[PDB]
Design a protein around this ligand. Structure first.
Ligand code: GXV
Ligand code: GXV
Ligand code: GXV
Ligand code: GXV
Ligand code: MG
Ligand code: MG
Ligand code: MG
Ligand code: MG
Lengths: 298, 298, 298, 298
């Protein structure tokens, strides 16, 4: 199974003038590697892919891949609505040295099932890399159902996992039973911090969740305890992860919150975000701070 | 805090001719008491309240209350769309000796917030019993938001808990923070089996969930392990409860499934259900059987 | 085609204690007949079926049928969640002299398609009357799709029409093409005032809409003009119907608004509504009055 | 009031390699102008903006503006998720000679109301052109409510209209009453063919709808008849517009259907569409042909 364990959706650090902040993004990457994560995912939702132009995404991917320098597996988010662009970004990712790509369903038009399957098959045909699907129905307005995902896995042998981003135990359960029941090495990662523990107990593989950026140790330690058979210890970490998603209510998009949390938890990066996100206000920064303090994360 | 712990939504047993089956309902009640449940809830969703007429509901409630004979706390579900009937059923419950009532929001019209608050205040004023709210937005089409529930708890001191029936960690978390933060003894019970563990870890109080009927021991033992501080053991039980809700996909309504599971797990009752539910077919009964066998529950 | 044209969902008039107000209900009935409606529908949504007990519904139906005394066709709404009660209320309606029944899908559980089909077939088989389906997905949470309605019409020859209560030209169009295409004499009536004209232009049959109660002449004259081939005149009436539904925003449920409008338009009936509806406040009554005045309806 | 009347969302014609087909696009533009439309809108949903790259969008806009050569007002769709790009594309439009821009809400993240308002203010402040809002909640997952639109119009005097793309009479009515009530010259255009007649009768201003591409004469003649006071004639054209949208069910996205209809109605342009749209199959092309024949459009 590929891309299992804890794989953060890394925040992209920008300067106050809105350019890629290489020193800060590099420092964040190095913090996460040092924390023991199993991989890194750039240009996810929290990486601001949807607020970046294609050339910007290419430049950020190349930078990140080269900085990681093969220390851990690297995933690049290459999706969008422009399918020709998805292919271009995906081929660019493979040429630049990525280990895999992560592809959401098109999220403007909710295309027909025939078109959706074709789209994923075309993207998967365009690269030799492993492809992770990305389900985020709250934002896309179109669910990647366990049945559909199984059909995709049956069709292309490089479609090998999913980031299932949904506050639903039923969806994670059914994804695992349906897809992993046919393809035991297909990877199921939850996209929310508070579903990691359940995902493992259900027979899934890990998480790609925003708290990976500012508190990776919580998820890394949970996974380690689980793998060591220390369930009580894993449940302890889980109690923390259950509470963390309160912070994401502070703003929408909450990409600002995540970067403010990176700062609060001890890595001083520019927290600039791209429009239509905006800077978190001071009152809400203090609220975030009190949450992190109550959970003992700063 | 009232009505905490494991409180099954007890199935109502009917004969093949569609009458209350007293010996079978009584035997089920006695099994659940013997299993160590903290209470019993009659005429919930799984108790078929919505397929019963008012006079039938009164007769069932009286019978159940009388059979239980104060061995454990008894809740009666008294809700519907007809608010005058809600009041009648609730006063009847109090006269018959119930310990509390459980009241869903009206689920045909999704009434204005002013009307909704007024409805609950009137119902709560009609009895001196404790009132548990019932949130089931997938069926009602109107969520009881944590803010609203807090407003209700602030308004009437007998509105003392909620059965929050939703596959959402965020909803449970927020219900607990918002309502229990203002009213530390307000009771938050989850309505789905696979959220019991998380509900406890989040600072909530228990569950009213269908598996209480046929595998009460799993929830009772989880709660006991949690109260004893043996979190690993509680997590073990949780791994089971994570899987159980697959069975509910076998039919809709799944009241048939629950009764078939009672039979398969060792209590031979008539499994008749009221229309528009219908008998579970033999293939799906076998499927249910294989599910219960895999989880070691029969 | 049965039950075509303008058929108001007649308001049920109550005294302050919530009992049937026979003189007021009768006067309303006579006003509508005198206005030239094609039929009358009692115990629809606007008739407060869902806030009335089964015995109450039977008394109201008997009264209404008897008062109408065969002057126009009479439809009784017999639906709910309790399917045994549906059958009882439907057989009661037939015995009491109703010309047809109107049956909504169960709206607590959204039952499986197999259960839903079986429900409607059983209800249709319980009577020898014509049966009109009732679609109100905003309230029921489960759409009766054109495909499903076609399947029902294909299955039972007494399932002969629908009240399609949705603000959707596409839904009405597709209902008409899919069902009337297979069953040219199946009756399609929209449930909203502002869709009557389009319904007629699409090949449908009329409307069961709330403004039937207080401004029947608008819909009756629209229909007459359309049948006489005076499309410009019909469009003139449509311009009024397009505006009327603003008033329904004044409260939820808006059964109060409709009765207040009956009073304002010249018929002094009690405006009492059953809980959890409540009286319309004086400021909103004055707003309703201004709107009616601007549309030249009082 | 600006940009009133019939303004087609013009299809973008491509060669097989997915590049702009200048002769075919120009011919289409000339056909529409000759048909008497009041304006032209490029790079709307039907113009495939969300499957085009930013440089491609700029090239298309420039070409279209230039070909139109001020014969009618020109709108350019400049929206997306990347707000910096929205500003670039909007300023580019103004520099290229557009008369106005059309901006949808960001449709990946459904951003907070504060962020949404700020977004629209920033885009409006980036140009001195008139700005038309674009509401398409079926695709965006976030409705621009009449209250929000009013707040935007109150805030910026160059936010001067909306393409309200929704199958809802209530939404159009309320948009008109709430926004035009406060801003009588704010332009309200429906985005669907079957809502033009109602939109005019409600006090709105026209339509930007896909049938503008292949049957502009229907909407142009409807509008002329309405302005001339010949309501019966207008209603006759409406009967045709009521039926046209059945064709859009032939695929999703239906940008293919629209181009095939342009061909079938007598203008031979390439029907190539960008992925993830795909070619319409021959059976569905024949079905489309039969429909157009039945409505007397080819
Ligand atoms: O992946 C989704 C994130 O926002 C939550 O961790
Ligand atoms: O009683 C609630 C049902 O959803 C079963 O858990
Ligand atoms: O019939 C539907 C009601 O909501 C009023 O038209
Ligand atoms: O504007 C939206 C179009 O597809 C409908 O005409
Ligand atoms: Mg993220
Ligand atoms: Mg239940
Ligand atoms: Mg009504
Ligand atoms: Mg279009």
């Amino acid at each position: 199974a590929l891309f299992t364990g804890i794989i953060p959706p890394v925040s992209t650090i920008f300067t106050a003038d809105g350019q890629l902040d290489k020193p800060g993004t590099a420092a964040l990457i190095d913090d996460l590697i040092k924390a023991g994560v199993d991989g890194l995912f750039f240009l996810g939702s929290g990486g601001e892919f949807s607020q970046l132009g294609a050339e910007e995404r290419k430049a950020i991917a190349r930078f990140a891949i080269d900085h990681v320098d093969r220390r851990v597996p690297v995933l690049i988010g290459t999706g969008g609505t422009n399918a020709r662009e998805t292919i271009e970004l995906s081929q660019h990712a493979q040429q630049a040295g990525a280990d895999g790509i992560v592809v959401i369903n098109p999220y403007y038009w909710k295309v027909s099932e025939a078109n959706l399957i074709r789209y994923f098959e075309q993207v998967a045909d365009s690269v030799t890399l492993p492809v992770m699907l990305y389900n985020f129905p709250a934002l896309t307005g179109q669910d990647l159902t366990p049945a559909l995902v199984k059909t995709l896995a049956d069709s292309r042998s490089n479609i090998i996992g999913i980031k299932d981003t949904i506050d639903s135990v039923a969806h994670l359960r059914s994804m695992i039973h349906t897809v992993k029941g046919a393809h035991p090495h297909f990877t199921v990662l939850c996209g929310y911090d508070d579903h990691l523990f359940n995902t493992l107990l259900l027979g899934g593989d890990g998480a790609i969740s925003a708290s990976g950026n500012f508190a990776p140790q919580v998820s890394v330690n949970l996974l380690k305890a689980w793998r060591d058979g220390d369930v009580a210890k894993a449940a302890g970490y889980h109690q923390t992860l259950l509470q963390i998603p309160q912070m994401y209510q502070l703003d929408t998009p909450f990409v600002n919150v995540i970067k403010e949390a990176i700062v609060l938890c001890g890595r001083p990066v520019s927290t600039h975000v791209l429009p239509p996100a905006s800077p978190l206000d001071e009152p809400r920064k203090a609220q975030l701070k009190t949450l992190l303090q109550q959970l003992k994360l700063c």
